[PDB]
Amino acid sequence: TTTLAFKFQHGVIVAADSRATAGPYIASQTVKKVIEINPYLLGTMAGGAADCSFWERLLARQCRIYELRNKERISVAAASKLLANMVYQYKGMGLSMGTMICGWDKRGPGLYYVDSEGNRISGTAFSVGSGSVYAFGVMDRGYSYDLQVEEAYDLARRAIYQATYRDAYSGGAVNLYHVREDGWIRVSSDNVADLHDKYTS
Amino acid sequence: TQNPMVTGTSVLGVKFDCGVVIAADMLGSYGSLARFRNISRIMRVNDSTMLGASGDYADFQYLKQVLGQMVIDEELFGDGHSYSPRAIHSWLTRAMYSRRSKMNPLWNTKVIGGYAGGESFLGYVDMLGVAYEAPSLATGYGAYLAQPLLREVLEKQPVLSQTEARELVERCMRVLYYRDARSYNRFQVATVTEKGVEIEGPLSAQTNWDIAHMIS
Amino acid sequence: NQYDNDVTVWSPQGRIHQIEYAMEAVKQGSATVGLKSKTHAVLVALKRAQSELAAHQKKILHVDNHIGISIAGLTADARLLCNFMRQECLDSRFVFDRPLPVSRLVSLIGSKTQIPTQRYGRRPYGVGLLIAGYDDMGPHVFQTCPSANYFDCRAMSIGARSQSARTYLERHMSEFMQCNLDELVKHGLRALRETLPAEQDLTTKNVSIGIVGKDLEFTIYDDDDVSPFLDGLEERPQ
Amino acid sequence: MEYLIGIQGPDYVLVASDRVAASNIVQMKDDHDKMFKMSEKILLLCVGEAGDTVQFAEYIQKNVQLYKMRNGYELSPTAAANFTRRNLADCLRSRTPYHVNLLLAGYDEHEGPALYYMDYLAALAKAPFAAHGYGAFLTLSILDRYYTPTISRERAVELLRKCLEELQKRFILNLPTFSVRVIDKDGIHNLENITF
Amino acid sequence: TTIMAVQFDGGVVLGADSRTTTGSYIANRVTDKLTPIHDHIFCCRSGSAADTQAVADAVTYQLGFHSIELNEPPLVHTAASLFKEMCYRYREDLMAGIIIAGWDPQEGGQVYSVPMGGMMVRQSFAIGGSGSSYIYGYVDATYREGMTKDECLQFTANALALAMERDGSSGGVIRLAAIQQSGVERQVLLGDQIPKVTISTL
Amino acid sequence: TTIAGVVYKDGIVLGADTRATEGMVVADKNCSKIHFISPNIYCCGAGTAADTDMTTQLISSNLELHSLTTGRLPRVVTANRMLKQMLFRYQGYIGAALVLGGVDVTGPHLYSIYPHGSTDKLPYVTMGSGSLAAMAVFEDKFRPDMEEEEAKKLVSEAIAAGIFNDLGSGSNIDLCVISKSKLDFLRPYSVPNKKGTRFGRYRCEKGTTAVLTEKVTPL
Amino acid sequence: MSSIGTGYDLSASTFSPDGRVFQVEYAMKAVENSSTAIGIRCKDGVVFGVEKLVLSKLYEEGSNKRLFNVDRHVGMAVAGLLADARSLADIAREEASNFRSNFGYNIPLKHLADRVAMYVHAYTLYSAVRPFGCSFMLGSYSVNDGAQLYMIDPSGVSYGYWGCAIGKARQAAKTEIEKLQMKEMTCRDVVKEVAKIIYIVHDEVKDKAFELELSWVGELTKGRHEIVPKDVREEAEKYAKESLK
Amino acid sequence: DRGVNTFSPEGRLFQVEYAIEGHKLGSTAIGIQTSEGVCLAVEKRITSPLMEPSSIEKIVEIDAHIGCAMSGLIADAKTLIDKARVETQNHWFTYNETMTVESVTQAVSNLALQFGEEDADPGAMSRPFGVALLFGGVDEKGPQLFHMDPSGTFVQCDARAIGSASEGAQSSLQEVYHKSTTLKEAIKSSLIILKQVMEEKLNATNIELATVQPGQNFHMFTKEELEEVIKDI
Amino acid sequence: RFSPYAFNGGTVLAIAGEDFSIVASDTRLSEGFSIHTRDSPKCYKLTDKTVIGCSGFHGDCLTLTKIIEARLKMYKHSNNKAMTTGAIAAMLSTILYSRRFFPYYVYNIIEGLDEEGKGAVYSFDPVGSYQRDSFKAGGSASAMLQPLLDNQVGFKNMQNVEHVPLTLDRAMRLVKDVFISAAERDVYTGDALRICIVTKEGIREETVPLRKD
């Protein structure tokens, strides 16, 4: 429903799509940066906006879940990452807010996708996004998106979406960091520039 | 920048340091809004035997810092086994009290000029009422930073390490000028000198008002 | 006896044996020597370990950018006290921003150590500390007891069989004062070796040095530059 | 505050409750597959309604509380007792710094009268009743039930009441809401009912 | 409010005080006595609003009372004026209370202090205070000189208060004058049938 | 709102008050006593806002009780002043209570008026509620500033009667509370200035305008 | 009695049928063990004379010192265990520092002495902690309160003295004070006297060896507690030595 | 009676001397630092086949690339390990990278001796723990094995053994284990030494091995891997 | 950005360019608290090792509080972690301050420019709200894009070949520094006196004062 960390579900994977951006949307403070951070190999997330705030809540989420997963020898789910983030952030509220992370893992009841925002919204949908400009994007994408898309098939879907998105979008100094998450692993498909993909596609 | 509303204000205090001494003129007179409650007030404090400090801005606020500095010094001197008040110690400590209050949305405003002589170094330092420390060449305080300081800086630019005497004429000159440009001034002003003897600040001495000029 | 059931138990003489008995614990610890000149404060220490097939973990601890300590006694307790001192030294650096006085820091340890010795149903801390610190009044090397009293020495040795080492300290007492950094460390090694038997002469591996002074901040040499001080051998001077 | 859309029609053949899946932040819908009726226990429901975020928040705490009584008593907790305990818990949270008005919707099995629905206002008021609406919508639906009331109403007749509402909701209401989850509850399990 | 004043005497102090504190039209205290003690060493004359002065007045009384009995010989006045400072440092953006402290301690010898509502404490010869009791600037300056004679000081205080009550509105009714020596406070009450009336302002 | 005065006379202390206790300018109740009797020794008049005054008297009464019993001294009005000043500060200067504390010590009878300020206020003779100055102003006028007890008691009653006449808020009976330090004579009817007209004629109705379908007693 | 596991020396809440408290008494025997600290009131100041115990051969000045500055113008000489003395220095210095801050005048010795004594006395009452094993003197000059000398023991008493001794030799040392007129007498002459008393009282079994430390707080220092000059110490040392012969 | 807090004329505390003995009571654990990685081996020593051998653990993770074998009272150690888990991830929030073997070990050791039996806070120990921990992992710096004692003396090791065989095993390690012995050979050295304290022969249900090797995270050896080292001892 | 209210302003503008092992950090040589500049001398820059050089600017009250703290965090890090201060010191400090300043809005941009204790050069940029990133261009102050661009155009060489056809050397960066400072005075009117550029290497600290042109 908004950008900055966004995910949509498939059976085979989830798509992880994110921006590299510095500051507010009015200027960058750097050009080289990747804001993409790997908190656990369960999935990737990274935002922007109120910078301290996103990093703080995810770092708590990362601490709790990772200790529990690693020691217990029981894999934590989509539901668990989401519950930790939710419980923490409402408490901390009044100390700036703007967390926009997308939680993925495969569970006993099948693949589960929950969208975590800083209001305290916790949502499953066709595609969800939290941050800013993807709000427009969910409209075109839904049409070109099946319930279950293959990984390869999904990579081609991202390339077209983006290539039109750069033409519409007027935010510069970004990269589209593309990751497919095959469950409790995370691999990086490509980290292609938004300026490159308009020519290709 | 913000500053609290000031009632009793200390304003224009110059300080320029010469070898193993500093000369200062600070007003001895603190107006409270309008009425000059104390024409006899002392903005000069004794941290220890070879330190002095002189402060401007809200006079009230200056007294809060004096006590904290005072209680810390009282415990630390007298024993002098290796611990006592030292030139670096007074500057930083006083800066932190000011920082502590900077964290709150109301800060206690005084802008201070430390001249000290510690364990081996003669120091002339500037402390702010929100914090910050540095060694300084010449600094003004309160109203002196906006109004006279640049003409004082200009005299200093050929010779930055001149004598007490040359400083003494400038400072004596500066009160006739104080009256002319700013209002909440008196011409009974205090001459403070920090030396190796101690911190001396005799009573208010005066010279001409000189606002009787009209020649164009 | 029953002059040492708790650290509140007085003897008719008017002495708590547990605080005294806590000093006997310092003798179980490893030999450390503290020496000062007029520009450096030097700490010479014995490191021991259970694996000598592995590098020996330092017995010199970090307190400030010009303060280092050498412990003799209880290892956990010395580290335990160290943290109170470390917190204060680093805090002193924020607030006061002088290079903190050895005499000032040491008295604050005296207030905390007094707490359990004053308190019933507790043990004193049986660790003796030699602190090297350099402030702007020059070096000081101070000894702090298992009690709470301090000595400002020019040279001190507390630890195992420390008497043997003092015989050296008594003999070159005049010399310490004039020295530069190099000279302080060679004397402390010659002292250090004496504690131990006649036929054991130190290696660099089990020697850690914490050097403090006017020309330097805080550097710990574990074998780094230990080899030249050790050179010029002298073996157990009686 | 009331500007959701709930209706619950109590009978003792069934109790039909429906809600929209339409938790919307920004301009699009974060939930539109998540169910808006939460499972406290396998025969008990709480439906939390208010702000989008505050809804998810109310349920998780409550879920722990229902189950806990089940454990403590060693039987299913009393319906009357739970409903009152859910009212004390929503008033306690009201005191706390974040002010939370929450419309709760209690479905319980009671010793009488049969299948029962106990009704909760945004005055944080527990009330026994038959014929209820939650949300801004409560006001029209309670009134339609009032013209034609039955509290032992069969399932066919429940569909007729529903359909006169659904066409009205589509053109006269600000909730055209083609995305709805509708469920009819017998005393043993949750059955899914037709959606218009 | 009240005209309060204290002028420094021979080695001790001469006081003046009014008897009304007014909040505009409504009298906060119809009767105000600022001659009473607050220990036997120190006395103060309290000005500003009624509530701001009263709260300060009871704490300096408590601290001072404990200090003379605990020490065994009485405390000095310089302590009393610092106790008032502490309070004002908290209340320097909300309330204000302009206290002017005078008496004499035996132990270190005579003191005249002004502790302000911003918090300061400084030694003066004579200070007169209140908001509308600042209108005697000429009067205080001409009257006070360095070591003024006791007979002159007595007349000048009564005379200054009179100029106040007539000219400022806030002032009014019985002037309470107090002359203090080393261990004793002696008060005289000057009629409000007596007042010297202002001469031709029209 | 309320019209309360208490006086220092040549006898002891006479408190005068109108009955009515009002929540604002409208009567919550037209019965009871505005001037309240506490322990035997302490009487307190109440004025200004009702909500703030009744509760202040009540809370101080516990404190004063503890102090009286332990100390075994009779209550002092200066003492009473300090307790109200400290309590009201604790609350943070919320609400309006002009309070009239009056108690007899072993010396003279002593009367004080404490407004809500949290002042250390010494009167001479005072009246409270309404506007503090406005009520106080009367005392200077009718009292020559000391006259015999009986003459003074008719005088307060007469001055308080005038405030009742001028300000219709006060209504019903005027009570005089003659207070010593063990004798509390509560004279309901010192003067009745006004009273209502009889509610003799009904506005009752038979059931045919509203009816009843139940009469049962649950168990 | 002294060997026991319940009460007596474990407690101090205990009373004997005589009324005694043994623990508080054991604390008193502890102050006795080390050498004497004397402090003499003049009508113009206090002069101390302290034996400063030489416990090694690698001494520097101020090592194991017993002279503390409680306040700017208060000096404190301790006798008995130095462990307990360091904690007592922190508590006394702290009560004084806050006093100066608030009152803004020189701490009256009568007040300071009452507060430290209360603290010692709170421990003697308690069986929960032991009481300090030292006895101390506080001595001072001011013109706001005069020259004052006070003494606080392990029990928790504060009374003023005009010349006091704490430590082993105190019964002998005190006698020498009755000989001297010291109530009226310059602080310059009294330094000569404290030095000669100490040299004669010392013997090689109260403690091995000492370093003479005298201190000023009087008309000479102008109301400052400072250590005496190198000159002053040596002439007073000399007079001690000449009287010793 | 006399207290336990007291120092003895030997010059050591009573409670602490008892705690070392507590280390000696339990099962033996070997932690060997090789420069190819750090292996931790522990004996299961099961007496019943109804037990499920996976869930007998005595190797627990401080970190995701540091493993720890613990000895003496199994229960007493577990608390120290619980506090350790919170610190390692906490370290990730602040530094923004994972905790070292050295940092974690010094922080737990401060807690090890704090003991005041009477008149000490209930949020602090009345008695010390009788556990010796062996923290073995490879971290940013490289393979490190640190040893922690119940006396709160921490030291760096390359080969350390603790448990009933603690003195015997430790001597025997110094002999075979050197830094001219590879990682797989370290696993063979530990297995031989293990047998005297064990009641039976070595098996793949009677050892549990886990190795943390460079460039890899902590791996718990599977039944096949345990069995390959069993074949050649 | 924000117009000084929360904390005192003290102006100043920071430019940062990273090469490969040489990094220039420049800020103006002034201490301000008031509209006038007190003294040219400053202690905005503080070095902790030759390995790391930190610059805190703007408000002077902020500048002293955090910089000393950074010296404390360094000390702690060498002891416990056993990695000498550098990159590791830098990531840690930016989180704790940026929480501290951002509810009551941040008026200092601290920039840690160093080498890691394992090696590889990092130049780190906070907005004022916690982020750390490695950069080869950086602009920081209210004018957080005014320098950024020159480093983007000249260093990166994206649609540019006339500053270098590749990427700048050490000799080239120092030449460019003097030029950039002369330029800044023209655009930004919040400076007085002198501009100080410190060049941070793993092997040489350099300092140069340069007059305001």
Closest CA to G75 of G2, G12, G150, G11: G150
For Cα atoms D125, D131, D135, give the angle at the middle one, nearest 5 degrees: 60
Which resolution in angstroms does this entry have?
11.8
- Tell me how far apart the alpha carbons of residues C238 and C164 are, in angstroms, rounded to a whole number: 8
- Do H61 and A71 count as a contact with CB atoms less than 8 A apart? yes
By CA distance, what is G113's nearest residue in E? E71
- Tell me how far apart the alpha carbons of residues G71 and G145 are, in angstroms, rounded to a whole number: 14
Structure tokens at H60: 């627990």
CA distance E193 to chain F (A): 15
Interface of G with C in 182-201 (CB under 8 A): none
Interface of I with A in 105-134 (CB under 8 A): 125, 127, 129-131, 133-134
Experimental method: cryo-EM
Amino acid letter at F82?
M
**Structural domain tally of chain C?**
1
* One-letter-per-residue 3-state SS of E60-78: HHHHHHHHHHHHCCCCCHH
Residue C164 vs residues C194, E84, G241, H9: alpha-carbon distances, Å:
6, 64, 35, 22
Write the residue in G62, G68, G72 that is nearest to B74 by C-beta.
G72
Helix (H, G, I), strand (E, B) or coil at E117: coil
Write the residue in B71, B77, B81 that is nearest to G101 by C-beta.
B71
Helix (H, G, I), strand (E, B) or coil at A97: coil
- Tell me how far apart the alpha carbons of residues C6 and C124 are, in angstroms, rounded to a whole number: 10
Closest CA to B6 of E82, E120, I31: E120
- Do B132 and I61 count as a contact with CB atoms less than 8 A apart? yes
Contact of I153 with chain H, judged by CB distance below 8 Å, is answered with: no
Residues of C in contact with B81 (CB under 8 A): 101, 103, 152
Polymer length in residues for chain I? 213
- Tell me how far apart the alpha carbons of residues H146 and C133 are, in angstroms, rounded to a whole number: 30
Find where tokens 């901390």 sit. A92
By CA distance, what is B72's nearest residue in G? G97
Closest CA to G173 of G48, G86, G64, G75: G48
Task: Tell me which chains share at least 3 CB pairs under 8 Å with chain B.
Answer: C, E, G, I
Residues of C in contact with B118 (CB under 8 A): 136
Closest CA to H99 of H137, H131, H133: H137
Residues making up the binding site of A: 49
Residue C152 vs residues A4, C105, C131, G116, G206: alpha-carbon distances, Å:
63, 13, 10, 27, 23
Residues of H in contact with C74 (CB under 8 A): 113
B1 in active site: yes
- Tell me how far apart the alpha carbons of residues C115 and C125 are, in angstroms, rounded to a whole number: 10
Helix (H, G, I), strand (E, B) or coil at B79: coil
Task: Tell me which chains share at least 3 CB pairs under 8 Å with chain D.
Answer: A
CA F140 to chain centre: 21
H-interface mutation test, from I73, I76, I80, I92, most H Cβ less than 10 A away: I80
Element housing I81 (H / E): none
Find where tokens 């009240």 sit. E2
Q: Which domains does chain G have, with CATH numbers?
A: 7-245 (3.60.20.10)
- Bridge partners (DSSP) of residue H68 are H60, H135
Residues of the domain holding E83: 1-202
CATH number of D1-196: 3.60.20.10
- Do C147 and G83 count as a contact with CB atoms less than 8 A apart? yes
Give the count of alpha carbons within 13 A of G30, CB side only. Answer: 30
**Structural domain tally of chain B?**
1
Pairing outcome for strands F4-6 and F126-128? antiparallel
- Tell me how far apart the alpha carbons of residues B74 and B84 are, in angstroms, rounded to a whole number: 9
Segments of chain I assigned E as strands: 14-18, 22-29, 31-32, 37-39, 45-47, 52-58, 108-115, 121-123, 138-140, 194-201, 205-211
Structure tokens at I97: 């301050």
Closest CA to G170 of G197, G188, G144: G197
Residue B182 vs residues B40, B143, B169, F174: alpha-carbon distances, Å:
19, 9, 20, 65
CATH number of H1-233: 3.60.20.10
User: Which sequence spans correspond to the domains of chain D?
Assistant: 1-196
Amino acid letter at H118?
E
- Do H102 and I132 count as a contact with CB atoms less than 8 A apart? no
CB atoms within 10 A of CB B212: 7
CA D131 to chain centre: 12
Contact C143, C128 (CB under 8 A): yes
Residues of H in contact with I99 (CB under 8 A): none
Peptide bond between residue A24 and the one before it cis (omega within 30 degrees of 0): no
CA distance G9 to chain C (A): 6
Q: Which domains does chain I have, with CATH numbers?
A: 2-213 (3.60.20.10)
CA distance A58 to chain D (A): 18
Q: What is the CA radius of gyration of chain C?
A: 18
Q: What is the DSSP letter of G35?
A: P
Q: Which residues contact I161 (CB under 8 A, 6 or more apart)?
A: none
Write the residue in I82, I91, I118 that is nearest to H95 by C-beta.
I91
Give the count of alpha carbons within 13 A of E64, CB side only. Answer: 24
CATH number of A1-201: 3.60.20.10
CA distance A71 to chain H (A): 6
Structure tokens at A149: 């898309």
Q: What is the CA radius of gyration of chain A?
A: 16
- Tell me how far apart the alpha carbons of residues G182 and F41 are, in angstroms, rounded to a whole number: 61
Element housing E27 (H / E): strand E26-29
| Angle between helix F50-71 and helix F77-91 axes, rounded to 10 deg | 130
Element housing F52 (H / E): helix F50-71
Q: Which residues contact I104 (CB under 8 A, 6 or more apart)?
A: B105, I6, I7
- Tell me how far apart the alpha carbons of residues F114 and F81 are, in angstroms, rounded to a whole number: 7
Chain G residues in contact with chain E using a Cβ-Cβ cutoff of 8 Å: 102-105, 108, 110-111, 114, 143-145
Judged on CB neighbours under 10 Å (0-12, 13-18, 19+), D64 is: exposed
Q: Which of A1, A2, A30, A44 is catalytic?
A: A1
Backbone angles phi, psi at H91, to 5 degrees: -65, -35
- Alpha helix (H) residue ranges in chain D: 52-73, 79-95, 138-147, 155-171
- Tell me how far apart the alpha carbons of residues B1 and E113 are, in angstroms, rounded to a whole number: 35
Residue H97 vs residues A59, I48, I94: alpha-carbon distances, Å:
12, 21, 14
Q: Which residues contact B144 (CB under 8 A, 6 or more apart)?
A: B11, B12, B13, B14, B56
Domain F1-197 class, CATH top level: alpha beta
I-interface mutation test, from H63, H66, H91, H95, most I Cβ less than 10 A away: H95
Q: What is the DSSP letter of B92?
A: H
CB atoms within 10 A of CB G15: 12
- Tell me how far apart the alpha carbons of residues A104 and A179 are, in angstroms, rounded to a whole number: 12
Phi-psi region at E125: left, alpha or beta (left = phi > 0; alpha = psi -120 to 50): alpha
Cβ contact I–G (≥3 pairs, < 8 Å): no
Pairing outcome for strands D44-46 and D106-109? antiparallel
Amino acid letter at B214?
M
Write the residue in C50, C119, C124 that is nearest to H170 by C-beta.
C50
Amino acid letter at D151?
I
CATH number of the domain residue B45 falls in:
3.60.20.10
Write the residue in I68, I76, I78 that is nearest to C94 by C-beta.
I68
Amino acid letter at B174?
R
Helix (H, G, I), strand (E, B) or coil at D159: helix
Q: Concatenate the DSSP letters of all residues of chain C into one string.
A: --SSSSTT---SSS--HHHHHHHHHHHHSPPEEEEE-SSEEEEEEE---S-SSSPPPPSEEEEETTEEEEEEE-HHHHHHHHHHHHHHHHHHHHHT-S---HHHHHHHHHHHHHHHHHBSS-----EEEEEEEEEBTEEEEEEE-SSS-EEEESEEEESTTTHHHHHHHHHTTTHHHH--HHHHHHHHHHHHTTSS-TT----GGGEEEEEEESS-SEEEESSTTTHHHH-S------
- Tell me how far apart the alpha carbons of residues A21 and A174 are, in angstroms, rounded to a whole number: 6
Helix (H, G, I), strand (E, B) or coil at F21: strand
CATH number of the domain residue C187 falls in:
3.60.20.10
Pairing outcome for strands G163-166 and G37-41? antiparallel
Contact A156, A172 (CB under 8 A): no
Residues of C in contact with H156 (CB under 8 A): 49, 51, 54-57
- Tell me how far apart the alpha carbons of residues G227 and G231 are, in angstroms, rounded to a whole number: 12
Contact of C9 with chain I, judged by CB distance below 8 Å, is answered with: no
Q: Which residues contact E146 (CB under 8 A, 6 or more apart)?
A: E125
Closest CA to G201 of G179, G162, G176, G169: G169
Residues of the domain holding B88: 1-212
Q: Long-range contacts of range F134-140, CB-CB < 8 Å, 24 or more positions apart?
A: F134/E26, F135/F3, F135/F5, F135/F47, F135/F163, F136/E27, F136/E30, F138/F5, F138/F162, F138/F163, F139/F5, F139/F7
**Structural domain tally of chain E?**
1
- Bridge partners (DSSP) of residue C42 are C35, C211
- Tell me how far apart the alpha carbons of residues A14 and A106 are, in angstroms, rounded to a whole number: 10
The edge-to-edge listing of strands for the beta sheet with I205-211 is I138-140, I14-18, I22-29, I194-201, I205-211
Q: Which residues contact I4 (CB under 8 A, 6 or more apart)?
A: B1, I59, I107
The dihedral sign for the CA sequence I185, I189, I195, I197:
negative
Known catalytic residues of E are 1
Contact of C15 with chain G, judged by CB distance below 8 Å, is answered with: yes
Contact F40, F184 (CB under 8 A): yes
Cβ contact I–C (≥3 pairs, < 8 Å): yes
Residues making up the binding site of A for bortezomib: 49
For chain F, percent helix, then strand, then coil, each to nearest 5? 30, 25, 45
